[model samples]
Target: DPLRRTGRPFGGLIRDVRRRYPHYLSDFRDALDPQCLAAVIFIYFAALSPAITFGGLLGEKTQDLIGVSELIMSTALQGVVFCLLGAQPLLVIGFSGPLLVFEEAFFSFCSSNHLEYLVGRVWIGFWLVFLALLMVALEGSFLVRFVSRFTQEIFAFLISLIFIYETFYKLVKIFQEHPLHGCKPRGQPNTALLSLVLMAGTFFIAFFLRKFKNSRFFPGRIRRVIGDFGVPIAILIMVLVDYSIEDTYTQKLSVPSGFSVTAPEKRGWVINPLGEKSPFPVWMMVASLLPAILVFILIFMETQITTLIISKKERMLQKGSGFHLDLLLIVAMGGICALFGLPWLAAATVRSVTHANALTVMSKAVAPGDKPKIQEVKEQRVTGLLVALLVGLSIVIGDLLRQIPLAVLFGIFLYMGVTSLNGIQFYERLHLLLMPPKHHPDVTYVKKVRTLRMHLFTALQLLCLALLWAVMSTAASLAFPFILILTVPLRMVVLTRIFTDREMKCLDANE
Candidate 1:
């Protein structure tokens, strides 16, 4: 019933909302528990602040999409509005890497056709909503049943890899070309060495503490509390250490003195989406719709898949899997934001998962050699509500945000990317090479498929991951949706010939 194409209109959507709306009290009640409250705030600030900081950095560096202040504002308005209006209030939404690339593509298109970036964006948003409506009319989530764990794992792997690579790459580049001093000056008491140490120290301390929950080293309750607040505490310690010990002009977040809003011809706090004159013609808008369709598809993939991952059975999620219904609000938000000429946001995999895991409390601990499980989630709006509050407060604290070194956040990013791969079967299969044969579990793949065959299956998947990863950087980056789209058929036609249904089903087995 939850999977049905619930109406996007008032009455139908209201019924869905009413049923789940009452549950918020219970969600809020659980959120007030001492540990749960601390977790939600710590993670939201630790994970998402760095997100907007980095997102704004990306958008500004590209120079075609939007600016730093705009990105931060959209993220703030989004969290505030979505928490009030969105269905799955626990699901955090923000600017995503795909949308950044989408903006880049549209930016290039605008420049090429002598049009304004903001103008092209409205048209894109219009078309994106229309396409989303089309999907809703067609009961898109029903069709998603065919996208089994095999396909889903590939996607999870792709994004998880991107996060890991982006983080590590930034760390390396920080040393290779110090952000402050260009070349890695030879033995001249450079900032690069300090940045590297800060990044690594932040990552290991946070990760080690986070993993302590399951370790025998500490008492269970103590470990759980320490593990829960690991990232934020690590960030705090590193910032203080950097302030006290470091003496270089190491780079930090570059926030502006004030928020800026601009249209093609006008400059102010609000966008006159239509300025004094039209920057581009209608035909060009129509032509851009083709790419807009691709962007639409990318949005669908990102939002849908993250929702799926969030609702995975182990989390014991409640009040209906609201991916489609929440998306109804997201579409409306897109149009609203577009009218104001703001950067579009989508369901971010890492942040949302972090949100879920952070708020959830353990009900049962799986025995050794058993798959992990969560007892229940403290499904509440307080975290989302407070997080949004902090986002609004950032305007005042922009300078303090500037004081924290970028390397510290980079460490958190690496931790995020690494933790996201926790139970993904694709990575589990990869781990087999390094792990001893005896220690490998007697799971679906190992029991049904031979060791050699399982390795081959894993290898083929890595190939698809490589294909999508490669295309992302080349001229085909705009065609990334197609690169991902074709993987379904590739799995359907080509991969089918190599592996049986039984093997494939268990390959990316869901616990």
Candidate 2:
């Protein structure tokens, strides 16, 4: 009786997969094979490479604060726990920037005052994770729904802006330091021109590859292969061309290093928040709490949102079942790692999405009858296992990994960042100045513009552009965050004009 009951639902799900994807059985079979495991591993590594490079850039000071051991533990643990517990099995988790920033600040405070505070911070972080876990076990992931869209957008915009700035700045520095005579130390004017050229080339190449993948210009068999790996393939080609040129010209290329698989030193874990006293100051603890809360909220929102978006794209039916549990586990992993003097990690947005997409691609290529029936949960476990093995192997070639050019990785970053903008709503596209209602006599042009003409969409576009500009401009780093916040007031002005007036209220009430 128990077997019959369980079998019925399992059969139904398999029937659904067969109906939706006649080839699913074949794909499942392929995916289960050793070769498919290798492919998944490759895809996972490709997805993570850019992120690890970006993480390396947070500066040595920031890196030390998080501790390399914490990073590894958090990454591996998050992957394992989330695969087993998350509602959306396809979503992967790893270290995120907001989490890193909070850790950095906390560690800096401990180091500056000669206090051993890491242990306390880890304990506190672990407690927070426990609280989150309790909430998740009770199915409280819905609490995320209360987070306002405005807040989410602000946070997402801030992150994207940071990524844009970081990518562009690094690119410019690379260009300035290029060993080629015309390239090295070129004046701002010349450098700007070359930068534009390089950026244009990168954009065009990436665009073409994406288009080719989606376009029906090629034979079906060839198109499938190209489409499946288009972005990475494009990146590989561009890197080869650039690197080959540099080699031919005997131009020196500088690449950052220092990734390892081994656990960090044990001494890094020992910290005391208190100097002479047994406990730390209340004020210092309070200060630490604020950043931790902010970081948790930001990471939680971003990770969940990214997960939702990817799940929808992949047509995954499960939404909120165990997401909070996964998040709680992530927090726990982070805290535990911290106690051992390791880098704190969070849910990785881009990497997780890419991994899901790769799985979808593989799933599509399977033949109908031969497909193996595998649950999403099982697939996630596979992802975790692959990640662990990859981490181990990465240690062997750590030096070679460090030699990868930043430009090559930045090209991929630009592709992902710009592609994310495609989801912006159409109504928001018009600029405020050009909005039709601004010219009316009843409303002052400024007021009309602020009311009917205020383009949140345009503001979003401008935000993206500002972020892109910030990427290229080294001086903009300190000021970009402020500029991002300014848009909130601009949005508020529009909202007030539309919703605050007596006339508007009267019309709405009458209706």
Candidate 3:
């Protein structure tokens, strides 16, 4: 039933590439439809917001060794390359949360051990790319068959919570700064209040406009346009509001005006992997495989899990799965990022899901008062391609990009986190645990499985999520990915023992 079920190594990859190549041209032709316009703008901001956010975090962590320049450049370059050449054009590539943590961990190790940051990462990159290629060659992605929705939903929820948490945390810090202390004669304008308003306003406008398509107030086509373009429109509205207010000093995006190395002292695009520049020993090249093993585990888990989420049975992607083929592209990108001292890119969870959902064409409700369901995904490469290109163009339009306030992006961040929870079965099951069984929605799990058993399963998942959150916060966070991989066995070997086949079937059903 699976596309990559072949026993032979590289067979599935060859098949995947051959299958997708035939329809490559049609990928563009399909995007000529009008909805693709909204998809482009929607996904562009989705990708860019995180690029800047993570870039800032990484810069502080690595002391500017790898920062916004590397993040955006790597994102743009790899995104374009993947959309144009990869098997699954829909996966949006960027610096992921797991990779960011791993990078911070490695940089701390380097700083303490008196090692060269650039030199060490080059070796780690080489080993990581090597391991990934070896996995691709051996059909490692096929092991994803063991990953059930139990693990899949947990990973996605972790990311979504991170998004919402980061946004909320940042806003709380603004209020913590006491922006309203001691009033002046003119009531010296509280930036915090203004920012709070902007942030909430952005989220409220986007949220309402998103539902406006199904409302009774407008023409069907116009409403559809408004709904499709809701987030971007909301951003523009908030930007105008912030700009219109006089003496408002809200924090704005830190966009670079020119393309150059972020660490001005480092002063080179390419890394000398042989330790040509810094005080580093060459013998550790083989030893770099130690951390490289952990990095590979993180990347493999992240890459495959996100691919599984995007190519789920329900999304109706007619194009075949590209687990092996896409991993091959990631391996290539890993090597390139290492060469240039850029953050490695992978199939980002939230952004990729948003991109896919944006491209999804939904059917209107059959009756007057029902919700719409997915008709089909547009399944085009053009949106991903242009979203990437526009991100690259963002460097050119730094002046314009800087006008957008960070609070507005934080609001978009919250909007994305909240909206991403819509179809997640775990979140639905979570709500079920709160309400009485009689009040449960008429879904397969609620009807097919006993309420107590469903609650037990959700409680178990919540426990696992709590454990993951705990692990991520500790000093030993470098091992978070390895800890995450344990969920597979817990689901397969452990959960299988507790639940009946029918119960497991309904609770962890794929579609």
Candidate 4:
């Protein structure tokens, strides 16, 4: 049934639009709730860190053709567009690593080919949108039904691994150089110790407050408020603590002082395809189809995988999902971004998970040692809409935004990566490897599948994850999405041969 489709040209699109139509007005009221306000505040900061971080790297790569301004603008514009019109508003949109990798690869391609980066990217966007539109008409999104839990768990864990690795890599570099003023002489210690303290402190504060609702020190309502606003509160406390050591040097966020084209001197608002400096022949536009096909695969996979993750049944989402319809919005935004030369946007996995967690309403624990259950998720559009709105506002508030130290954001990044590990079966099974079978949690999988079989599956996923991380760290990262898509067949074809049907069912169940 998952593989079967309606076979109608616009069947999926029409179904999604109508299904979501009834929830539009109610969504507005849902957004007005106090829980939505907290989500907005939390997601705003969570989204900002990556936007600025990726934008900086992009600016350096593209020679300022598309930088922080373009990144923020595209995120703000597409986020609002996606929240208002896309099927799953709970999906947080931003610049992702693969997309960033694509941009870097394309920029280099343009540099060597004597073409302007902006103009070439515009052509790719046109092809991307056209290709995506064709897929939308064909109900291409239903292909997600073929992606088993094996593939989804690996994909999700890879993202978390990247986050954790990147944070530690950065922190290690800080200690390697040990700076003061501006890269202090050989062996003098200054900000490294303080930086680690701040990072650890920020993570601890946020982590502790996240469980505040179960604490005995506060009333239920007060603890709920504290717990709900944990990340933002942690960011605030660390930032204030930094002010006490202002005289001691530490790295802060790198944000542009004003909102303008990153290369206003040369580039303008719109990218001209037939520019005097580096116009491509008519042939290159058509030739761009090669890379465009690859980029489309990247966008399609990332979007579909993240949407699938966000719409999992356990999230208790009341509003129906819009697979084809949501892909349409991303395609449309891809085209619009091309026209204006902005960073292409897609569903960011970690941030989307973070948004879902922020809006979650948990049931109170009945017994002393019992963990709480997720009672509901306050799914609404306003939180995402406002979060991006604040990111857009940061264009002017750059000076204030820069006050937050980089260590705090790194800590937050680590928190996101670690917290996201909670529900993943892959992470759970890895934990099982350390414990004896008697100590294992009495989950359905454990009861149904042999311990060795589970370990085999977990080891295979770990190998796949390790291979992906290695591939992504190279120039071939442009083909990263292609390699990622290979895992699907790897699961369906190769995995089916190695495991029994019952074993597969127990280990790879979508639910």
| Predicted structure with the largest TM-score when compared to the true one | 3
- How much lDDT does each candidate structure score? 0.69, 0.50, 0.78, 0.78
Q: What is the TM-score ranking, best to worst? A: 3, 4, 1, 2
| Comparing 1 and 4 on TM-score, the stronger one | 4
Evaluate model 3: give its TM-score: 0.85
- Model 3: runs farther than 4 Å from truth? 1-9, 22-46, 53-65, 104-116, 175-180, 183-189, 245-248, 274-278, 281-284, 305-321, 349-383
Worst 10 residues of 2 by lDDT: 1-10
Better of 1 and 3 by TM-score: 3
The better-scoring model by TM-score among 2 and 3 is 3
Model 4, span 159-203: residue lDDT tens: 777767767887778888875555434445477888899989999
Q: Candidate 3's residue-wise lDDT over 342-449, tens digit each? A: 878778876778788877877877688654777778887888888888888777776787788778877876887788798888888877767876788887887787
Which runs of model 1 end up more than 4 angstroms from their true locations? 5-15, 21-36, 64-68, 104-116, 167-189, 245-247, 258-278, 309-323, 353-383, 433-440
Candidate 1 lDDT tens digits, 1-511: 6676554543335556677777766656755577666766666665455665465447445562455566777778888887775677767778775676566766665567577766666767777777777666565655565566766678777766776777666766665665444442433346777888888999999888876766888676677766667877888899998898655767776666655442233434444444425645757556666876787666677777778878876679866657557776776578668867677777777678877767666545556645456666767776787787777666666677667887887787678767878778788889896787788887767878778888888788888888887877775467777777777777678888877777766675555
TM-score of each: 0.82, 0.63, 0.85, 0.83
Root mean square deviation (Cα) for candidate 4: 4.2
Per-residue alpha-carbon lDDT of candidate 2 for residues 226-328, written as tens digits (9 for 90 to 100): 6656565665665566555442322222322344323345243355434324566566554555445544565566666664566452345332333334566
